[PDB]
């Protein structure tokens, strides 16, 4: 079955059926075997597409609701509840199967970054008593991932770069700490820049793409 679930996830990706792809990857994770780098990327792409569509719908509704009518509010709450259910599913998989003490630094940082990301999506729509708790859960996950990456990965590693990029976005938009956001993006860019000339061909595109995103955010914020 596990080989079949992964093959069905690849077919669902080709057919642009991301909810099916996510459900097949969830079934494969629940088999208990660690995910290869290709399998981790399949799991990540599937849920990122699903939650990306809900986040985009939530922003359209929220924008109509603020530009202006109980209908917009009710429908916005329905989309929010669905988005929350997807985030809770990913956070549940991370806690029960993917996040462990063992494994290389790369896999540990990948899953801890994913935990920070899905709590950050929950924080985007949080307005009540849980808001502070949700934001501190995103912060704690990114901070634990940052500590591992600085000790065990080179500054040009694309997983390390992508984590800093997302944690910098968290500081800017969620935590309302733009100075911390700018200084983290600047430090990450500069430390990678110093080792850019020794970077290996396999990480060329990924590392340089994230360095460009770090540069784009700095140009937007400063």
């Amino acid at each position: 079955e596990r080989a079949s679930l992964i093959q069905k996830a690849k077919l669902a990706e080709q057919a642009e059926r991301y909810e099916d792809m996510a459900a097949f990857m969830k079934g494969a994770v629940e088999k208990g075997e660690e995910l290869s780098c290709e399998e981790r990327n399949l799991l990540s792409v599937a849920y990122k597409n699903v939650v990306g569509g809900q986040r985009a719908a939530w922003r359209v509704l929220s924008s109509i609701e603020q530009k202006s009518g109980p209908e917009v509010r009710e429908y916005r709450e329905k989309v929010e509840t669905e988005l929350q259910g997807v985030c809770d599913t990913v956070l549940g998989l991370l806690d029960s199967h993917l996040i462990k003490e063992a494994g290389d630094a790369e896999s540990r940082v990948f899953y801890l970054k994913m935990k920070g990301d899905y709590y950050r999506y929950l924080a985007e729509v949080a307005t009540g008593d849980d808001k502070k708790r949700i934001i501190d859960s995103a912060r704690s996950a990114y901070q634990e991932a940052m500590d591992i990456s600085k000790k065990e990965m080179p500054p040009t590693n694309p997983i390390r770069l992508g984590l800093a990029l997302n944690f910098s976005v968290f500081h800017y938009e969620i935590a309302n700490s733009p100075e911390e956001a700018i200084s983290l993006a600047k430090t990450t860019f500069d430390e990678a820049m110093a080792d850019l000339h020794t970077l290996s061909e396999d990480s060329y595109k990924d590392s340089t793409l994230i360095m460009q995103l770090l540069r784009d955010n700095l140009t937007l914020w400063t």
């Binding site: 990301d117 992508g162 990029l165 997302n166 976005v169 800017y172 938009e173 995103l213 784009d216 937007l220």
Partner: peptide, 6 residues
């Protein structure tokens, strides 16, 4: 138009 990892 801020960027997070793709």
């Amino acid at each position: 138009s801020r960027n997070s990892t793709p």
